[PDB]
Design a protein around this ligand. Sequence first.
Ligand SMILES: CCCCCCC/C=C/CCCCCC(=O)OC[C@@H](O)CO
Ligand SMILES: CCCCCCC/C=C\CCCCCC(=O)OC[C@@H](O)CO
Ligand SMILES: CCCCCCC/C=C\CCCCCC(=O)OC[C@H](O)CO
Ligand SMILES: CCCCCCC/C=C\CCCCCC(=O)OC[C@H](O)CO
Ligand SMILES: CCCCCCC/C=C\CCCCCC(=O)OC[C@H](O)CO
Ligand SMILES: CCCCCCC/C=C\CCCCCC(=O)OC[C@H](O)CO
Ligand SMILES: CCCCCCC/C=C\CCCCCC(=O)OC[C@H](O)CO
Ligand SMILES: CCCCCCC/C=C\CCCCCC(=O)OC[C@H](O)CO
Ligand SMILES: CCCCCCC/C=C\CCCCCC(=O)OC[C@H](O)CO
Ligand SMILES: CCCCCCC/C=C\CCCCCC(=O)OC[C@H](O)CO
Ligand SMILES: CCCCCCC/C=C\CCCCCC(=O)OC[C@H](O)CO
Ligand SMILES: CCCCCCC/C=C\CCCCCC(=O)OC[C@H](O)CO
Ligand SMILES: CCCCCCC/C=C\CCCCCC(=O)OC[C@H](O)CO
Ligand SMILES: CCCCCCC/C=C\CCCCCC(=O)OC[C@H](O)CO
Ligand SMILES: CCCCCCC/C=C\CCCCCC(=O)OC[C@H](O)CO
Ligand SMILES: CCCCCCC/C=C\CCCCCC(=O)OC[C@H](O)CO
Ligand SMILES: N[C@@H](CCC(=O)O)C(=O)O
Length: 439
Amino acid sequence: KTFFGQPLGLSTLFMTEMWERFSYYGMRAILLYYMWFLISTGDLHITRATAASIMAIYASMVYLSGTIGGFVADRIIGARPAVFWGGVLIMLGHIVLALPFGASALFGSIILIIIGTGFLKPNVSTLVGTLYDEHDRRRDAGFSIFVFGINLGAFIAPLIVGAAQEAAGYHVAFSLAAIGMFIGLLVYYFGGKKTLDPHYLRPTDPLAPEEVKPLLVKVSLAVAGFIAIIVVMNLVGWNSLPAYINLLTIVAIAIPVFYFAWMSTEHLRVVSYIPLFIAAVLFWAIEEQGSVVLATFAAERVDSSWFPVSWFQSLNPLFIMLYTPFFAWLWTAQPSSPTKFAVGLMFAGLSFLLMAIPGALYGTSGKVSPLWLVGSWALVILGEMLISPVMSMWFLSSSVGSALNAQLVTLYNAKSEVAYFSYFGLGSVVLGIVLVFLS
Ligand SMILES: CCCCCCC/C=C/CCCCCC(=O)OC[C@@H](O)CO
Ligand SMILES: CCCCCCC/C=C\CCCCCC(=O)OC[C@@H](O)CO
Ligand SMILES: CCCCCCC/C=C\CCCCCC(=O)OC[C@H](O)CO
Ligand SMILES: CCCCCCC/C=C\CCCCCC(=O)OC[C@H](O)CO
Ligand SMILES: CCCCCCC/C=C\CCCCCC(=O)OC[C@H](O)CO
Ligand SMILES: CCCCCCC/C=C\CCCCCC(=O)OC[C@H](O)CO
Ligand SMILES: CCCCCCC/C=C\CCCCCC(=O)OC[C@H](O)CO
Ligand SMILES: CCCCCCC/C=C\CCCCCC(=O)OC[C@H](O)CO
Ligand SMILES: CCCCCCC/C=C\CCCCCC(=O)OC[C@H](O)CO
Ligand SMILES: CCCCCCC/C=C\CCCCCC(=O)OC[C@H](O)CO
Ligand SMILES: CCCCCCC/C=C\CCCCCC(=O)OC[C@H](O)CO
Ligand SMILES: CCCCCCC/C=C\CCCCCC(=O)OC[C@H](O)CO
Ligand SMILES: CCCCCCC/C=C\CCCCCC(=O)OC[C@H](O)CO
Ligand SMILES: CCCCCCC/C=C\CCCCCC(=O)OC[C@H](O)CO
Ligand SMILES: CCCCCCC/C=C\CCCCCC(=O)OC[C@H](O)CO
Ligand SMILES: CCCCCCC/C=C\CCCCCC(=O)OC[C@H](O)CO
Ligand SMILES: N[C@@H](CCC(=O)O)C(=O)O
């Protein structure tokens, strides 16, 4: 008796992550429309472009947070408490949006979910590893299943939450996201006590006595530096919301740039990763624009009067679930991995070049078939299979992509739509071609 051949403990972690991803993408699917709503009613004083930018940098900080969450668990609080308290924070994040408040609750929600997801996401992935001995052949399949649960949650969430929002309003809808996380916590807490190794209740690599001060000094100088930059920003008058978004943008992008510089055999192999890293960043940029630019296109440019427009956010994980089996049968039934990055990026590029067509053909003032978006996601997710299944800089790439997005999505609107999709679509394809030369 197993969970699809794997230890039953995988079900617990499967469920845990499925329900967190549910809460997250349920929130993601309507948060942009929520901010629109708050703007339309005069509660939130930003442009829609800024709103879009907020979505992107939000994602960016979530993934950035995920890059330290593993450290915090491994060295300070343990993987299992990280996941639990991570989940608690996420739930609080959604509860904050379920409360009868408006724009004033957004920052609080975002911070709670940023911190919480940073604690939970990397560490739930870690606990999946813990189900297996070093020599266990099932490890790849186990993770493959675990990834299925991520998208299962990501898939039904826009459906359920979007429907709820339409039916009962945003606050109720966001409360459902809170409930989603609560369900995950329940299964995680009680299921975890039955399946998970007690060793992970504590850090497996606790800070040695002499490691504490140096860590403390490093964090302190960073926070002080960040605070100092903000002080200077405010004295010089660079204190608009977009200004803060730019600071966050710069921080998120400077982080890999500093590792670039930081680091002849091993050299030319670190240098060799840079085009790959750029490729991943650009891919995730495009992929992460699904919930922002494509979310916007869905709401403004699509014949969608008969269903909640947030449901388009289900197309992304739907296609992942559809493609993953095929690519199992395919990688065994061969392109080099850098080549896989190029083509993955090429397909992302094509997913945007496609989107240029309805506007170029039909104009951008009318509405087009939903199939355009369906095809768009079909292409980018095809790209995801090529790059995703194939260390810090890697999970950092998605944060950098979203940071880049915080800048780029503010350029998207009906007037720029065709050029936007065309140029960044063509750019990605070309850089895919560039990678081919370098492959
Ligand atoms: C396996 C991945 C390959 C799939 C990618 C190809 C997807 C291309 C889709 C283009 C079709 C969208 C337009 C068709 C349509 O319904 O037009 C009718 C009209 O109402 C459009 O405004
Ligand atoms: C204002 C919002 C309050 C949020 C409270 C949500 C509760 C947090 C997690 C629920 C997961 C189940 C936890 C079960 C549990 O801790 O058992 C209680 C006790 O046996 C443990 O010492
Ligand atoms: C690993 C930590 C990542 C850094 C955490 C800082 C990120 C904090 C907020 C993310 C950006 C959110 C800006 C949008 C926002 O807060 O909305 C506030 C309302 O619009 C107020 O006008
Ligand atoms: C006010 C936020 C409180 C929540 C804790 C967030 C974590 C804040 C400080 C933890 C110190 C993290 C420094 C270590 C680190 O990030 O290194 C990452 C390495 O790349 C992992 O190998
Ligand atoms: C801020 C309101 C929320 C308060 C949280 C409820 C606190 C109640 C009990 C604390 C539970 C601590 C257990 C955390 C943990 O390590 O989970 C691991 C489980 O044993 C399964 O992995
Ligand atoms: C050691 C890290 C754990 C601490 C997590 C930091 C939490 C930071 C901010 C959470 C506060 C969110 C509440 C804000 C809020 O409720 O909206 C404001 C009022 O309701 C306005 O009507
Ligand atoms: C103990 C933590 C688990 C809590 C999970 C979330 C459940 C909490 C509240 C559910 C209902 C939230 C209020 C819904 C709401 O007020 O929407 C109505 C709007 O105000 C419009 O009438
Ligand atoms: C209200 C701000 C609270 C923010 C707290 C941020 C803490 C950031 C990093 C924690 C580093 C210090 C950890 C101390 C610790 O427990 O390690 C002890 C050693 O492992 C001893 O075995
Ligand atoms: C956002 C972080 C703001 C900067 C301040 C971070 C300080 C947070 C925690 C540092 C506490 C000092 C670490 C030493 C410590 O408490 O460990 C206790 C020992 O592990 C007990 O044996
Ligand atoms: C981590 C270092 C942060 C960056 C330090 C750069 C310092 C450069 C100028 C600081 C000037 C602070 C007062 C300026 C001020 O009050 O207003 C200036 C005028 O509004 C425009 O120049
Ligand atoms: C995770 C703890 C590390 C500390 C980072 C916390 C976030 C710090 C700065 C981001 C603030 C984002 C802007 C929030 C805001 O509403 O300011 C907008 C002003 O109203 C400008 O008019
Ligand atoms: C030792 C490095 C010190 C400087 C670090 C670089 C980061 C400095 C500022 C972050 C970006 C601020 C740009 C402000 C901005 O975007 O425009 C201002 C607003 O749009 C107008 O209110
Ligand atoms: C395997 C499926 C691949 C589907 C993607 C193929 C897309 C190829 C070319 C699309 C280029 C559309 C740009 C049209 C354009 O820019 O016209 C400008 C008009 O004046 C509208 O501003
Ligand atoms: C199993 C793969 C089957 C092949 C799918 C690859 C799709 C290749 C090219 C699709 C061309 C994209 C342009 C769509 C298009 O131009 O149609 C316009 C609308 O039909 C207007 O009526
Ligand atoms: C089965 C996918 C799960 C649900 C995801 C929601 C995706 C939203 C729409 C996808 C299907 C669109 C309807 C198909 C179609 O032919 O378009 C009808 C339009 O009214 C034509 O203008
Ligand atoms: C193994 C993956 C399964 C394949 C899924 C790929 C499907 C991706 C996009 C489907 C949209 C293709 C357009 C359909 C179409 O041409 O219909 C147009 C109508 O006849 C309107 O004239
Ligand atoms: N779509 C995947 C990965 C997203 C990313 O890393 O940017 C998830 O939500 O788990």
